Amino acid sequence: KEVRKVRIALASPEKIRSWSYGEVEKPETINYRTLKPERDGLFDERIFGPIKDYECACGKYKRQRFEGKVCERCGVEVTRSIVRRYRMGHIELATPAAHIWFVKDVPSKIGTLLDLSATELEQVLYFNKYIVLDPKGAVLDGVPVEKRQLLTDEEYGGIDARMGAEAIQELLKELDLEKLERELLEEMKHPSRARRAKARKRLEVVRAFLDSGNRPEWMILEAVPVLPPDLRPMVQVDGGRFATSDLNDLYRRLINRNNRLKKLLAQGAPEIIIRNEKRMLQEAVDAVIDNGRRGSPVTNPGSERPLRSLTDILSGKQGRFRQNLLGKRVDYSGRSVIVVGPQLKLHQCGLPKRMALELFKPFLLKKMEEKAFAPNVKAARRMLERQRDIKDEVWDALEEVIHGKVVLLNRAPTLHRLGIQAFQPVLVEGQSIQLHPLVCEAFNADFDGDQMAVHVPLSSFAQAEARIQMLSAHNLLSPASGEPLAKPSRDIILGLYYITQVRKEKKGAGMAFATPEEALAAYERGEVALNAPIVVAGRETSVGRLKFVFANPDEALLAVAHGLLDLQDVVTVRYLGRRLETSPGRILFARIVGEAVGDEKVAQELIQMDVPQEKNSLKDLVYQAFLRLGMEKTARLLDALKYYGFTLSTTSGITIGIDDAVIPEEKQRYLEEADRKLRQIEQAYEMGFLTDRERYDQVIQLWTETTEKVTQAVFKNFEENYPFNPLYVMAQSGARGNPQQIRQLCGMRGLMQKPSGETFEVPVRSSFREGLTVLEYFISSHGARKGGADTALRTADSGYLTRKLVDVAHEIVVREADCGTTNYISVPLFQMDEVTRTLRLRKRSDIESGLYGRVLAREVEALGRRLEEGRYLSLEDVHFLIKAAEAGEVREVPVRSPLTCQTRYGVCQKCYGYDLSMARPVSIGEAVGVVAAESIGEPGTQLTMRTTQGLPRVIELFEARRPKAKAVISEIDGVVRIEEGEDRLSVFVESEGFSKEYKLPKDARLLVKDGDYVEAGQPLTRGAIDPHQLLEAKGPEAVERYLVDEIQKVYRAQGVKLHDKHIEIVVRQMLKYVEVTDPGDSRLLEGQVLEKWDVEALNERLIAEGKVPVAWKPLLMGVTKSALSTKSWLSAASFQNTTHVLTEAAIAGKKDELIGLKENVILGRLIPAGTGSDFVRFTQVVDQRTLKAIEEARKE
Amino acid sequence: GKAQFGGQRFGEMEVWALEAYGAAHTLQEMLTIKSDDIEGRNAAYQAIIKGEDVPEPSVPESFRVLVKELQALALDVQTLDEKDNPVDIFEG
Amino acid sequence: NFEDAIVISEELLKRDFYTSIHIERYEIEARDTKLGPERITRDIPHLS
């Protein structure tokens, strides 16, 4: 049977000994000259496991069987060389102990459970002498002296108590357990409430020891164990000088003392000394355990280096907890520079022979033997080591070697599941790695020598896991926002456009006609006899419209074979079933799409048959296509496009010849008539028409008005003349170029932002096409670096957001189908402008990312269609509801989301659901927990970090900290009236009776005039909206709503798109905990989990009626504070100061259950997800005929 | 790397996403026979030399390590299942 | 040349146009030990 929990019990003397196998009740260990322990010590193998292969220290039967190896004078049990990695040891100590973690942690686990003047008392209860007053013994020497403590050194009396830990030891033991459940459960109802506050806290350790099964006492160590050797190594450096684990030098003096005093007591009882000695006994352990503490770090004779300790070691910074989720190094790895894989079909991938081989040595090998060639395994090993220059036959193998299995890839800062994908790698020259286009997008796959990785999976499992879950091919869409990603672009586009833009000429006006102008036999000949050209204006036609009457798409094309037209002309041609105007160029697109699509007809469907193709354009198709066609196909499409576009995007040879960097003739007249509006605002200033303020805002709002003219103008000209101009087209289509940029190139730049956010009233007339001058540069400069500080400080903070995020919901997973809940949510379609207050529906996207794939909770009627209760609404579907409200017939689109969905430790399928990015109801087990996280921060990237908005808020949010200027909130409901002006500012929220004095700092921008009307917890002043303060007086959901949304607001304000769901999921845990009042079992506060509260608050009134419901309240945590209180510890560690966590924990039993990711991973289990879930892994496959040889051995 | 070379790293991100996909094993095989768990790497290494399923590591190194780095600092750190019962986490 | 890639003509290799010379520096240190001093001779066993 395999694991299914991990309970941390305490450390017992009896048990510390129980283990240890040996008993390093011996000196130091090593021997340099002769590698050997040291007749009993730290390495004496006899007590642990054998250093070598099975064998003793002298030599015995390294026989596999018999069990129980030892000797005459060589008792080195023969059971391999590894076990040196767990078998512990022990130094049965001299007398008392203190595992610091109960002394100087945070609460002082002992100096609490027993009071002992918080601190200073324990502190003086061993070291600094000071004697404790233990027993017995009738009590007052010059004053009573209350069965409790101390007495000062030369503050006579005597002892009949002692000192050292023995004190606190026999102390703990003799200490009524339950009575304190009464001596505290009497000072809990009749107290003052000042220091009768810690009263309770006593129990929290108390009861923690009781209903736990863990005894105290043991806190003082009667056994100070010894970790294994193969763990605190003694490796040989460069010859004879070694490198101990640094820890081992601690355990050192730890024995050094326990021996030096172990003698003093055997002989020579000089009191004062015995004292000055034990003082070190602890300080020994003290160090060893948590060296660093107090103010004196151990001084290795020489350096001033602190040297680890039991603490440090476990203390992340790769301390057994973190070290896992931070690194480790592969066995079948290999990285490299990446390069274009033009040819490469999607799913395919790079990998040059050179590495490609070294990264497969294994399989190759055997496969070789299994082939007539290369006799014996190892024998083979020798032929691929004959330096270089391989043979022929070989490779062939390497091929039949990989055909079938895939590899994973990854850029530098991976970020999303996509950040890695799999591909049927292929052998290929050049030493760099070849990679397919499309993908790029994901990894933000750049091409400037960047590199990626490649991991090799062996498990008949991991492999399958990959391609069916990680093939770029099977993964096309970004859960991040249910839209494509394998989106052709930054070229592919360019191509497609050109061949689907069509032309427009002008040497011909009085052209077309409803009734043939003169004739056709004429209209045309007028062409072979100059003037109006093929395509051109008209009321109903262009020469082409007649010159070319094509039957099949073929012809139209076969035409282009001969220099008649150029794809883009408007020719008459019968496609499928009718007459069509389109170009040889547009039509082709289709077929292209079509064929490789499979059905030349449904194709035409999705397609937007007439209009220049582009980013947005296809994308839909893209998505679309997928919609009504299996992923399989979807790809091929994506593919060819890639191709077809490419080769095309080149046959049509476009380029960049500066001249093409067009400047709209109206530049002059514009920079001319504008240049003049200035001599009229400065010569308008000469007098007094304008203040220095009314003035400066004019030269500014001046050039920007003209600037915008430059922009749009150079563009208008860009459509009526040169509609095929390189630059443009691009920007138009998807290729490259945004509205902005282009400008700076051709028309002009504008006004710059000073270093302190100002703007010189002097513009940048020149445009890059022109050699911008000396000054304009020195001022246009700031921008790139003050905007380079972004790419700067915005890159560092790894995933800062990401992490914190993660830690929280790594739990949350599809753990069931339908929480079963009726409860739903009211989705906001119409925004409420908190300023104008006037209304308006939301913008396109938002919506989608609010309803997309949501689940209806209470059916909806509108326009005649009826949306039953519970149907995954499709984009189309949501699309609909959209027009539905434009047509207003519905206000809040009710839906089942995660924000609620009760399943607790994960999410209910029909809640959230769908958007597997795959556009299909969410399959069970998915790691949404992450996913959410994942997505959310992926944009954290491009979020401005200048400071409020962007990232700087996100923190504020998730975390939740009363931002600057709190924003005055209406606690209650009522009326209002403002008072005073230019002295003492404030406002008043006076309902009926209670006129709440709502102040203002003398500088507030309020917005709820003087009179108005309301309802509970709301944005009064303006500014912000505090998390906690709200909640409290308005409920938990409420906040949530704000949260996400709020967050979203910035995201939206930066191009961020992303299903809301995600953000939600996060939020969820933000609630997870609640405080307590009127209890029925645990402490009267202990923060707490919802479910835990109800499987106990819906169980102490149902089957086990009585006690008390044990209510709670509204409690808010933030990622941070969050995780921290998560019940699990293994995970609980990894943060702040682990000590604490364990500390407390250990004490009471404390179990885990290993339900989570970060959980089962710190240990390296088989993640409770997907394949490692509870619904698709406990399945046994049958083979039709091998079910009837299993049906006759069952009825016997 | 004396004879043959290199040894690629692997970070959290990697995992989380790995987590992103129900990459179960792809995750586990990425945390074992390809790094610490000495048992495996050899075990596995051998495994292909003959071509078998290959891994299936008993219980990941690190788990034991830690538990031991634990006791190697007090605290039993036991192990139970679904019925809450004694484990046998080290068999040696 | 996609996204930011570039094509080349074998031509340059022909003319051997873009070629770089590079010298890697290798070093070694022999120490004094308890197990004996670390010499360095053109004599080392099993080496064929």
GROMACS .gro file of C-alpha atoms in nm, chain A residues 2-11 85-86 225-227 310 324-334 362-363 366 414 416-417 458-462 465 469 926-928 930-931 1162-1167 1169-1172, chain B residues 6-14 16-28 30-31 33-36 48-50 53 55 59-66 68-69 71-72 74-82 92:
model
  110
    2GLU     CA    1   0.113   0.358  -0.086
    3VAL     CA    2   0.100   0.686   0.118
    4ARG     CA    3  -0.217   0.884   0.188
    5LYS     CA    4  -0.121   1.128   0.463
    6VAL     CA    5   0.172   1.264   0.662
    7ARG     CA    6   0.134   1.332   1.035
    8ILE     CA    7   0.406   1.516   1.220
    9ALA     CA    8   0.433   1.378   1.572
   10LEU     CA    9   0.685   1.510   1.826
   11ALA     CA   10   1.025   1.372   1.931
   85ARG     CA   11   2.098   0.800   0.357
   86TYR     CA   12   1.842   0.748   0.635
  225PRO     CA   13   1.985   1.244   1.747
  226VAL     CA   14   2.231   1.232   1.460
  227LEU     CA   15   2.133   1.261   1.095
  310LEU     CA   16   1.924   2.234   1.148
  324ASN     CA   17   1.169   2.117  -0.507
  325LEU     CA   18   0.947   2.379  -0.666
  326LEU     CA   19   1.252   2.583  -0.769
  327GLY     CA   20   1.487   2.363  -0.965
  328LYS     CA   21   1.642   2.017  -0.968
  329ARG     CA   22   1.820   1.917  -1.291
  330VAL     CA   23   1.691   1.682  -1.563
  331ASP     CA   24   1.851   1.365  -1.690
  332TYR     CA   25   1.721   1.378  -2.048
  333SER     CA   26   1.764   1.747  -2.110
  334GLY     CA   27   1.920   1.975  -2.369
  362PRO     CA   28   1.945   0.485  -2.456
  363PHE     CA   29   1.655   0.364  -2.668
  366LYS     CA   30   1.879  -0.142  -2.756
  414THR     CA   31   0.788   2.999  -1.926
  416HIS     CA   32   0.159   2.945  -1.931
  417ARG     CA   33   0.097   2.575  -1.987
  458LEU     CA   34   1.010   0.798  -2.097
  459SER     CA   35   0.703   0.673  -1.909
  460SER     CA   36   0.485   0.504  -2.163
  461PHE     CA   37   0.279   0.745  -1.950
  462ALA     CA   38   0.438   1.096  -1.955
  465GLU     CA   39   0.043   1.259  -2.131
  469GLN     CA   40  -0.240   1.722  -2.356
  926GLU     CA   41  -0.820   2.015  -1.462
  927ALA     CA   42  -0.583   2.232  -1.257
  928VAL     CA   43  -0.790   2.545  -1.285
  930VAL     CA   44  -0.330   2.703  -1.137
  931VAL     CA   45  -0.475   2.785  -1.476
 1162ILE     CA   46   0.718   1.892  -0.211
 1163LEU     CA   47   0.734   1.518  -0.172
 1164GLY     CA   48   0.705   1.430  -0.536
 1165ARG     CA   49   0.391   1.222  -0.551
 1166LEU     CA   50   0.162   1.175  -0.850
 1167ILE     CA   51  -0.032   1.504  -0.829
 1169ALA     CA   52  -0.469   1.605  -1.099
 1170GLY     CA   53  -0.573   1.497  -1.445
 1171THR     CA   54  -0.408   1.159  -1.476
 1172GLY     CA   55  -0.336   1.168  -1.108
 1202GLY     CA   56   2.555   1.922  -1.936
 1203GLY     CA   57   2.267   1.903  -1.695
 1204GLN     CA   58   1.963   2.126  -1.765
 1205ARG     CA   59   1.771   2.296  -1.483
 1206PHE     CA   60   1.396   2.308  -1.419
 1207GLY     CA   61   1.193   2.570  -1.236
 1208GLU     CA   62   0.861   2.619  -1.058
 1209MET     CA   63   0.705   2.788  -1.357
 1210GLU     CA   64   0.781   2.475  -1.550
 1212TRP     CA   65   0.300   2.494  -1.234
 1213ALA     CA   66   0.227   2.477  -1.602
 1214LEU     CA   67   0.322   2.114  -1.598
 1215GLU     CA   68   0.054   2.130  -1.336
 1216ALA     CA   69  -0.147   2.340  -1.578
 1217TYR     CA   70  -0.182   2.027  -1.791
 1218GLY     CA   71  -0.288   1.713  -1.606
 1219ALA     CA   72   0.072   1.625  -1.682
 1220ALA     CA   73   0.071   1.400  -1.374
 1221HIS     CA   74   0.368   1.174  -1.447
 1222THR     CA   75   0.525   1.411  -1.695
 1223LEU     CA   76   0.549   1.606  -1.368
 1224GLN     CA   77   0.661   1.319  -1.141
 1226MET     CA   78   1.026   1.531  -1.408
 1227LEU     CA   79   1.091   1.528  -1.033
 1229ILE     CA   80   1.444   0.952  -1.230
 1230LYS     CA   81   1.575   1.264  -1.395
 1231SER     CA   82   1.747   1.407  -1.086
 1232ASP     CA   83   1.769   1.308  -0.698
 1244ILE     CA   84   1.579   0.135  -2.139
 1245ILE     CA   85   1.904  -0.051  -2.195
 1246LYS     CA   86   1.649  -0.333  -2.225
 1249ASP     CA   87   0.807   0.048  -1.896
 1251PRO     CA   88   1.033   0.387  -1.404
 1255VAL     CA   89   0.866   0.663  -0.318
 1256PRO     CA   90   1.056   0.972  -0.439
 1257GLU     CA   91   1.394   1.032  -0.277
 1258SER     CA   92   1.340   1.379  -0.137
 1259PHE     CA   93   1.023   1.272   0.052
 1260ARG     CA   94   1.225   1.032   0.264
 1261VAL     CA   95   1.520   1.276   0.278
 1262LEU     CA   96   1.306   1.547   0.428
 1264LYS     CA   97   1.467   1.230   0.782
 1265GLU     CA   98   1.604   1.583   0.773
 1267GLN     CA   99   1.351   1.358   1.263
 1268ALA     CA  100   1.707   1.474   1.214
 1270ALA     CA  101   1.297   1.592   1.636
 1271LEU     CA  102   0.933   1.524   1.533
 1272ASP     CA  103   0.838   1.174   1.417
 1273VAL     CA  104   0.664   1.276   1.093
 1274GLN     CA  105   0.462   0.956   1.052
 1275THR     CA  106   0.247   0.835   0.762
 1276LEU     CA  107  -0.108   0.687   0.736
 1277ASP     CA  108  -0.354   0.619   0.450
 1278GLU     CA  109  -0.736   0.645   0.428
 1288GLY     CA  110   1.548  -0.032   0.551
   0.00000   0.00000   0.00000
